[PDB]
Design a protein around this ligand. Structure first.
Ligand code: D3F
Ligand code: D3F
Lengths: 306, 306
């Protein structure tokens, strides 16, 4: 029993973190096989960040412009290229600790683990959801950029995030491991801001199913609702519209608990209109939206506490 | 910016997790040098758990009664002893992945990282506080016992918890790595229950300092208080009494933010009596008590957002 925001064990990623230095700028890189990945912003100087032309800044560099440090060992760069907002540095040593991996572009609403790192040294690990507005509420200080986000699937690490910037509201933005930003953000100093966000409806419903699996039914009711009537309430409370696809995804959780998805939606509607009346759900006084259906099935028992 | 419950990177502990089998019972063990540590409950049968005599159950075992599996490799037990509520199995191979480590007995209020494990395979990692009533609000299913709790100090892993049981309220209990239980619990099936708990005052104050370091001052006020007047309010709201030692510990955070500890206590008192009036603190609608002063200094910037 219990229910916590659980991260994936981080060892397989820890063995991939390196330090990349260009000029006066140091940040983190990801070393897989004979390639190091890092934010291309490493090549900017303290006067370059307003309107840096990365094509122009990079042509002016050589392989030995880049210092890559793996622990106390210095790796030699024998090649370099730009891929979107990342640099790819070829090095003369293949990472012996390379795990099985893939690069994936995650969808909004989906969760992953972040290994926060400074100067190539892992510092902490925590779970994050990709917000609908394509930012994450991370925890990051200066020098964290190049820290990565991942999920682990058996022995395979699916890398999905590399950190690049903090936005004015203190939330965070970055790219996939192909260097394409999540969201409309750019790696230069502008007036960019997070767009308005919304609550991840599918994840709140997932979490209500987790609460029932863990033995709590207090918030249920005798009503049902149609998708459309639910969605009228949803927009009132700044929730994502629920779709038939989302209803289908909740099938397994619905089967395990014997509660119809649209009946759970009726419960949510009531929670939204009436509040929680001093009560908690899985320890929480608020409706949580950073657990996916997948996250609930991973962590919760396969047999419910009836 | 941001503020999250951050766990320590778990790789150094992942390389220490093994599977221990005796009879029909399988659970997790911790392999350091040539010793495997695990809960002594591994030697009970399905009819032994009411009043097992572990001295009696163990004398009846040999070294080959125990099957220890490290990944796909079988370790051979060449010795065994009981230390309080743990077994210590000597094996014929020293763990090549042994990190620098120590065993520590943590105090209530203190936090650590849990590496949740099943059948010797790490599954997830999350941060926990040792409650004043000596339980933890973990997330654990059948087969998690022998999962460990730890803190990491440079390259040194300080092991402080090994998991043994779930109590009737769904909270968790275990021992230090000398096999001594935290709390009055015993490793047998009885009517034992968690005693009443209280909020960790020192940690709530720490977290209020974190909120100010991160730029938020809304909850402050123009008042101060004495220790004694604060403590009158504290017992009303089921908070730990604040002591001069706790005031002294908050010194560094007090200096960084320019807010006197007893002035922050006046703020807490007001929060306790008046509520949060629809507002949040570091994203939270409630007062959080699972971050220590140490945790705040580890994660927060050393320069406050004035
Ligand atoms: C990719 C990257 C960006 C920055 S940044 O200078 O700090 C930065 C950037 N940025 O990416 O160039 C954009 C923005 C904004 F415009 F999006 F707000 C804000 C910041 N910032 O936190 O000062 C730093 Cl230091 C390091 C890296 Cl690796
Ligand atoms: C050390 C240990 C205990 C149990 S236990 O059978 O599950 C157990 C124990 N226990 O430790 O013997 C005590 C209590 C209680 F009395 F404290 F409530 C409750 C349980 N339980 O969750 O069924 C299991 Cl399976 C595995 C281990 Cl390694």
């Amino acid at each position: 029993s219990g229910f916590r925001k659980m991260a994936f064990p981080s060892g397989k990623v820890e063995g991939c973190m390196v330090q990349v230095t260009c000029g006066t700028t140091t940040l983190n890189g990801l070393w897989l096989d004979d390639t190091v990945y890092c934010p291309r912003h490493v090549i900017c100087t303290a006067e370059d960040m307003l309107n840096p032309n990365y094509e122009d800044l990079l042509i002016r560099k050589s392989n030995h412009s880049f210092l890559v440090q793996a622990g106390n060992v210095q790796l030699r760069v024998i090649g370099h290229s730009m891929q979107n907002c990342l640099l790819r540095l070829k090095v003369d040593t293949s990472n012996p600790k390379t795990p099985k991996y893939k690069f994936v572009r995650i969808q909004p609403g989906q969760t992953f683990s972040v290994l926060a790192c400074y100067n190539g040294s892992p510092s902490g690990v925590y779970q994050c959801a990709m917000r609908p507005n394509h930012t994450i509420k991370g925890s990051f200080l200066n020098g964290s950029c190049g820290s990565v986000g991942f999920n682990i699937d058996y022995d395979c690490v699916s890398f999905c995030y590399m950190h690049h910037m903090e936005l004015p509201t203190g939330v965070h933005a970055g790219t996939d491991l192909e260097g394409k930003f999540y969201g409309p953000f750019v790696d230069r100093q502008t007036a960019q801001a997070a767009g308005t966000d919304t609550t991840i409806t599918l994840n709140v419903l997932a979490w209500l199913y987790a609460a029932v699996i863990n033995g709590d039914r207090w918030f249920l009711n005798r009503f049902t609702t149609t998708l459309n009537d639910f969605n009228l309430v949803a927009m009132k409370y700044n929730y994502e519209p629920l779709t038939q696809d989302h209803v289908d995804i909740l099938g397994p959780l619905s089967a395990q608990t014997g509660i119809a998805v649209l009946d759970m939606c009726a419960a949510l509607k009531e929670l939204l209109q009436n509040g929680m009346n001093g009560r908690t759900i899985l320890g929480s006084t608020i409706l949580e939206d950073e657990f996916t259906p997948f996250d609930v099935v991973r962590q919760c028992s396969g047999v419910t506490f009836q």
